[PDB]
Amino acid sequence: GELKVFLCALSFVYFAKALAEGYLKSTITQIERRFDIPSSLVGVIDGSFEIGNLLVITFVSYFGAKLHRPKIIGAGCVIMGVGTLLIAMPQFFMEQYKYSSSMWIYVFLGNLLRGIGETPIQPLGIAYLDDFASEDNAAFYIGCVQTVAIIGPIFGALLGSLCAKLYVDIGFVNLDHITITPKDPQWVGAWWLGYLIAGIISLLAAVPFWYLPKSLPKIMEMARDFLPSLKNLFGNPVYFLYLCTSTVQFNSLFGMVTYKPKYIEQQYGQSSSRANFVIGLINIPAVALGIFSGGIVMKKFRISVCGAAKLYLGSSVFGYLLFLSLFALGCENSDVAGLTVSYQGTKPVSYHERALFSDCNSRCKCSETKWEPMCGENGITYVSACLAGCQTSNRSGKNIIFYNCTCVGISSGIVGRCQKDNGCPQMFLYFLVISVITSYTLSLGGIPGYILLLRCIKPQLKSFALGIYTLAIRVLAGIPAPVYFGVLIDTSCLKWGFKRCGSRGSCRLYDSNVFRHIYLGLTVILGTVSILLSIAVLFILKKN
Numbered sequence: 001g002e003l004k005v006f007l008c009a010l011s012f013v014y015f016a017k018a019l020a021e022g023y024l025k026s027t028i029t030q031i032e033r034r035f036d037i038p039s040s041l042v043g044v045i046d047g048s049f050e051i052g053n054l055l056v057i058t059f060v061s062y063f064g065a066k067l068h069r070p071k072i073i074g075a076g077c078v079i080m081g082v083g084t085l086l087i088a089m090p091q092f093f094m095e096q097y098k099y100s101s102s103m104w105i106y107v108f109l110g111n112l113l114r115g116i117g118e119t120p121i122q123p124l125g126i127a128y129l130d131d132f133a134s135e136d137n138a139a140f141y142i143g144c145v146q147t148v149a150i151i152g153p154i155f156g157a158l159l160g161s162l163c164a165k166l167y168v169d170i171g172f173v174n175l176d177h178i179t180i181t182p183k184d185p186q187w188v189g190a191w192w193l194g195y196l197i198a199g200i201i202s203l204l205a206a207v208p209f210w211y212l213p214k215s216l217p218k219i220m221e222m223a224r225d226f227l228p229s230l231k232n233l234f235g236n237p238v239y240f241l242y243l244c245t246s247t248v249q250f251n252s253l254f255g256m257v258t259y260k261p262k263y264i265e266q267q268y269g270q271s272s273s274r275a276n277f278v279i280g281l282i283n284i285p286a287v288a289l290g291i292f293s294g295g296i297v298m299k300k301f302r303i304s305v306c307g308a309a310k311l312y313l314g315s316s317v318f319g320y321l322l323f324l325s326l327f328a329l330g331c332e333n334s335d336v337a338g339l340t341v342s343y344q345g346t347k348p349v350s351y352h353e354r355a356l357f358s359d360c361n362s363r364c365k366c367s368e369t370k371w372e373p374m375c376g377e378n379g380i381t382y383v384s385a386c387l388a389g390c391q392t393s394n395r396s397g398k399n400i401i402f403y404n405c406t407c408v409g410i411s412s413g414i415v416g417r418c419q420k421d422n423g424c425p426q427m428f429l430y431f432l433v434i435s436v437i438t439s440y441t442l443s444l445g446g447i448p449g450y451i452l453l454l455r456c457i458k459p460q461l462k463s464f465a466l467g468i469y470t471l472a473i474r475v476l477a478g479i480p481a482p483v484y485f486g487v488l489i490d491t492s493c494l495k496w497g498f499k500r501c502g503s504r505g506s507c508r509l510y511d512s513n514v515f516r517h518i519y520l521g522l523t524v525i526l527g528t529v530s531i532l533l534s535i536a537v538l539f540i541l542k543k544n
């Protein structure tokens, strides 16, 4: 009765939190077309969240275990809603839009408060759900909660896409005078409406926790016992080894997921939409289904702790074994003159021989920086039409065709990177299928992980363990994994882009072989380390 009510309230809170994070991610990304934002501002916006969450996660998890957990969760939800509403404050204060000073403080404070209020949700909520539920149903409840958490960001991104379709000043200025269209690239959307909706939903999600009981059928002592509790948690070998296992596995998973869309873009030549669509709307449902399936399997067969560890190890092994198969599914580099091939059509050229300037385009004073893709009738892609030796351009229908191009004749061409011919879409189909299966298999061992985490510690330290677990994920896996993955990937960049100010943008073209090698190898190595640690965990469990 009351347990189901708490489960529903926690699921709604998880949905609201994930919707807020997904909307933030979608809006920041989609605002790029009009407002050229420095890479520092987006980084600081994300990092204020991290500081706010990490500074209080441990204290809330520990000092809130014996307090009124539902009321602390409700207060955290209220703080999250207040921060989300504060994020949208600058809209009401800035002047009407017409087509970094004293205005981003609102955004930073709103994100800081949101990160602070996010902390009591997972540790205290999961501990409360586990304490008063039967041993069989705890896994199922945690599985449902984590499935909702995984699903949420899809709804957040959908809300972001819906809001970006509306004009920024809707309600403030009559839309009849507005003559601009979203296709016109001076358009900016109503980013504040989604933040207001997310804040309202987060505030409404805190209502049920005021009526939930403290338990189902002082601070000085906590301060004194904090250190012995930490020693007991780290004195437990199962907990420490599973913490290391999860840290390494999430180091692998965050790196794989973060740069998966870019890997698809560069390896298989797919468009920007084609990759984000198959990642957000295909792999995330697979992850959610894997989590739910793991929870259902744990509940139905009454799998014990040893069985949970065995399932974790098996899921990890059978996921990374399938991920190893992605090495075979690789397309070769597209024929690009001056970077991968020379203007004479020679097969791969070394580093020292990069001949962006050639004899055929010698009469052409071209700029090195711009990247406008085009390929001629010979099937060789060129950096831009200027370096192709083209003299005249004709606009036919929706396309532009360049004539009298000297380099290709060594003479017509089309704009954009024309497709890879030697069966690359066929390989892309198998890559997509194997990636979906790998994501499902790897996410299958998610709830057995939590069961292993909760069934091998003394109960009065469940909350203070879970928070540490979360603190372990963000400090060691959530934050670092994108950084060095991106660095090692960018070591394989052949041509860099630039922004309107001069700082280098995202790399426009990578070497397919080195990119695939690094991206798959790092993930597989981290997965192998995680598998070894899981084997150690299973052996220690069998010993005890």
Ligand SMILES: C[C@]12CC[C@@H]3c4ccc(O[C@@H]5O[C@H](C(=O)O)[C@@H](O)[C@H](O)[C@H]5O)cc4CC[C@H]3[C@@H]1CCC2=O
Residues within 6 Å of the ligand: 027, 028, 031, 035, 036, 037, 038, 087, 090, 100, 101, 103, 104, 107, 191
């Ligand atoms: C970032 C954001 C979209 C853009 C919003 C914005 C956009 C512009 C802005 O002011 C302008 O910023 C420029 C910049 O960008 O450098 C500076 O050059 C200008 O001098 C400054 O007048 C302030 C804000 C505050 C809220 C921001 C939103 C919060 C959530 C979101 O998605």
